[PDB]
Amino acid sequence: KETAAAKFERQHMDSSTSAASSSNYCNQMMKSRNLTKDRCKPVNTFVHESLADVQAVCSQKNVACKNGQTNCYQSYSTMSITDCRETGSSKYPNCAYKTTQANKHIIVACEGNPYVPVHFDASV
Numbered sequence: 001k002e003t004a005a006a007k008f009e010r011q012h013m014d015s016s017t018s019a020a021s022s023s024n025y026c027n028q029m030m031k032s033r034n035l036t037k038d039r040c041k042p043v044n045t046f047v048h049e050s051l052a053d054v055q056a057v058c059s060q061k062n063v064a065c066k067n068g069q070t071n072c073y074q075s076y077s078t079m080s081i082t083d084c085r086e087t088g089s090s091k092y093p094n095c096a097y098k099t100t101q102a103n104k105h106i107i108v109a110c111e112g113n114p115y116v117p118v119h120f121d122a123s124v
Ligand SMILES: [Pd+2]
Pocket: 078, 105
């Protein structure tokens, strides 16, 4: 019983660095975070910000989730994220990732008490 909230931390938080300073980054990180145990996860996003900052988004701009739910919120300022996308030559269990860096607003879905993120919906 890993909590969705802990699951969110494992899958999307990386405060430890302020930017994906490497092209290794995704390869390492996707494997490190167990996003390659069942299969190659096609796409994952990592957020280079404090946990409190990312949790604070849960009381920022309420916006429609991609699945039609009302429990998504958009960051007021941009955040340092790193998109990991799976390449063509990625074959499980040799999962390989094109690292990509940007500053975009994030959008997350929150739920629970305390009200915290359990899902990364999009960057904008
Ligand atoms: Pd903006």
